[PDB]
């Protein structure tokens, strides 16, 4: 029933245009993307095990023309494989086009295109920061609820070539074994405390040694020694996360043992930050493509 090729073509038809121009998909089509992608998310593991080559991207936040930019730098699927780390919606002006193209590509290339859950893929958050308002203005509240049901089934973390641990936010004090992530039940809303919360909300902090309070008013901050012990315990080389705006698009922490990625240049139209995209090759070498703000 769902014509994915037609949907992707219309979404990509606005390429090269001045940012702002919408793509008007039909309600039944956007609902179709949610229901079908949801099935795929539930069919695949909640802790993804992926293999290079792979392109990894951080926060997008409805900056649709910067998503299109990332693909023209990285290569449009299926030329390259992709892992996104969450926060697809809110703040930007085109959350709908952004999430729709991502879900379209997931349905089209389910073994070569991956999406993790960010803290904004939660009804309680995206009701406040723009996505609910965008859905209401352009379609209806029922469609927004259909996105919620989809988001509640997104995977939570990925391990790339048994060496890179990927999640939106960061580590948890309750994360002792990877089996604990695998035992998280979907669908679920993101709780105010616990493992799932921390994985989507925590931040690294240079001034903290162990675990400390997070200025967000939720989850914790973690220091470089916590990163060191986590990598050694689970025999990993790198934590790759997002969740925080960084000026150069990427930023290393704890002597290159953790990296923060952010893929929305000129975030909110307020910051003057670059976006970045991490490339991982077959030899497990990491490199970065940089998108300066325009
Ligand atoms: Mn974000
Ligand atoms: Mn976030």
Could you characterize the architecture of this molecule?
The chain is an alpha/beta fold and 294 residues long. It has one domain: Metallo-dependent phosphatases (Purple Acid Phosphatase, chain A, domain 2), CATH 3.60.21.10. 33% of the residues lie in helices and 18% in strands. The chain has helices at residues 4-13, 27-43, 64-74, 95-108, 123-126, 131-138, 141-151, 178-182, 195-201, 224-234, and strands at 47-50, 54-57, 82-84, 113-115, 157-160, 164-166, 203-204, 211-213, 220-222, 238-241, 250-253, 258-261, 275-280, 286-291. Helix 2 (27-43) packs across helix 4 (95-108) and helix 2 (27-43) packs parallel to helix 7. The structure holds manganese (II) ion (2 copies). One manganese (II) ion is lined by residues 59, 61, 87, 243. One manganese (II) ion is lined by residues 87, 118-119, 168, 243.
Set down the secondary structure blueprint.
Blueprint: H1 4-13, H2 27-43, E1 47-50, E2 54-57, H3 64-74, E3 82-84, H4 95-108, E4 113-115, H5 123-126, H6 131-138, H7 141-151, E5 157-160, E6 164-166, H8 178-182, H9 195-201, E7 203-204, E8 211-213, E9 220-222, H10 224-234, E10 238-241, E11 250-253, E12 258-261, E13 275-280, E14 286-291
Parallel strand pairs: 1-5, 2-3, 3-4, 6-10, 7-9, 10-12
Antiparallel strand pairs: 2-13, 5-6, 8-9, 11-12, 13-14
Helix pairs in contact: 1-4, 2-4, 2-7
Bound molecules: manganese (II) ion (2 copies).
């Amino acid at each position: 029933k769902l014509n994915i090729d037609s949907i992707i073509q219309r979404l990509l038809e606005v390429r090269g245009s001045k940012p702002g121009k919408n793509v008007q998909l039909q309600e039944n089509e956007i609902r179709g993307l949610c229901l079908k992608s949801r099935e795929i998310f539930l069919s695949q593991p909640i802790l993804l095990e992926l293999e290079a080559p792979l392109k990894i991207c951080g926060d997008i936040h409805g900056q649709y023309y910067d998503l299109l930019r990332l693909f023209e730098y990285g290569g449009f699927p299926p030329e390259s494989n992709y892992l996104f780390l969450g926060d697809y919606v809110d703040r930007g002006k085109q959350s709908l086009e952004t999430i729709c193209l991502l879900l379209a590509y997931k349905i089209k290339y389910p073994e070569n295109f991956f999406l993790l859950r960010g803290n904004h893929e939660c009804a309680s958050i995206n009701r406040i920061y723009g996505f609910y308002d965008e859905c209401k203005r352009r379609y209806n509240i029922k469609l927004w609820k259909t996105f919620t049901d989809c988001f509640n089934c997104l995977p939570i973390a990925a391990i790339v070539d048994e060496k890179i641990f990927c999640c939106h936010g960061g580590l948890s004090p309750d994360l002792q074994s990877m089996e604990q992530i695998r035992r998280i039940m979907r669908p679920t809303d993101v709780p105010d405390q616990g493992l799932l919360c921390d994985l989507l909300w925590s931040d690294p902090d240079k001034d903290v040694l162990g675990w400390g309070e997070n200025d967000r008013g939720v989850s914790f901050t973690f220091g470089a020694e916590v990163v060191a012990k986590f990598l050694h315990k689970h025999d990993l080389d790198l934590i790759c996360r997002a969740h925080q705006v960084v000026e150069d698009g990427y930023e290393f922490f704890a002597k290159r043992q953790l990296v923060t990625l952010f893929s929305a240049p000129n975030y909110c139209g307020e910051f003057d930050n670059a976006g970045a995209m991490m490339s991982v090759d077959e030899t497990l070498m990491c490199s970065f493509q940089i998108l300066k703000p325009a």
